[PDB]
RNA sequence: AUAAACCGACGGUAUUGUUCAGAUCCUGGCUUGCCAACAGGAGUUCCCCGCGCCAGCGGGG
């Protein structure tokens, strides 16, 4: 797996659906400032796609306190419509996770529209360890729908 | 097609050389920006799709 920093020329970066687009010329994506942080299965340089730097795939270990942040989709459906209350996003968030890790701490920031509409939730705090290899495939599947439009990329970091 | 008509005012040419504006000089004394305050409310998201008990759950844009 490849952890990379890649810039994406204003150019090109205009609007949501532009941004898979110059990155594929699957793989995972979150928009930092077009500044984003790129997970792929292979190493990612265009003109439209600049890469200031990139390979990793972690030890980890079982009961290990880890900080961690995902932006994510929560939606219902009956259309997807979007989980606003605070007690729906945090189940919702422990529910995805499965029993690859338990939620300890979580702050639900409710991020501001992007654009059919997309209400993404920007979820930080720490977990620690379960399930270590379905943490792994967690990580390289993403969580939620709307995956390509920057939601899903589960970053870890440890303290 | 008129005291009109036709119809040059023309030719040559350094304004030059010299020259401190200069000495003296606090802008200065006085002065709360201050009193009140949950960031909470609100599930619209337009598609294709797969599996349902039809309630709702997923993967691709």
């Given at each position: 797996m490849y952890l990379s920093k890649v810039?994406?020329?204003?150019?090109?970066?205009?609007?949501?659906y532009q941004l898979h687009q110059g990155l594929w010329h699957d793989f995972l994506f979150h928009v930092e400032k077009c500044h984003?942080?790129?997970?792929?299965?292979?190493?990612?340089?265009?003109?439209?796609?600049?890469?200031?730097?990139?390979?990793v795939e972690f030890q980890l270990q079982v009961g290990v306190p880890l900080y961690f942040?995902?932006?994510?989709?929560?939606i219902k459906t009956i259309c997807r419509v979007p989980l606003i209350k605070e007690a729906?996003?945090?189940?919702?968030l422990q529910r995805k996770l499965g029993n690859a890790?338990?939620?300890?701490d979580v702050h639900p920031i409710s991020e501001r529209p992007q654009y059919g509409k997309?209400?993404?939730?920007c979820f930080?705090?720490?977990?620690?360890?379960?399930?270590?290899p379905a943490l792994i495939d967690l990580v390289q599947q993403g969580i939620g729908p709307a995956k390509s439009m920057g939601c899903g990329?589960?970053?870890?970091?440890?303290l």
């Open positions: 810039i994406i020329a204003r150019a090109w970066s205009r609007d949501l984003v942080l790129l997970q792929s299965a292979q190493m990612p340089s265009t003109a439209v796609a600049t890469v200031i730097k990139t390979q942040r995902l932006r994510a989709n929560p729906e996003q945090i189940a919702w890790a338990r939620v300890e997309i209400q993404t939730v930080e705090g720490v977990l620690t360890i379960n399930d270590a990329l589960l970053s870890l970091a440890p």
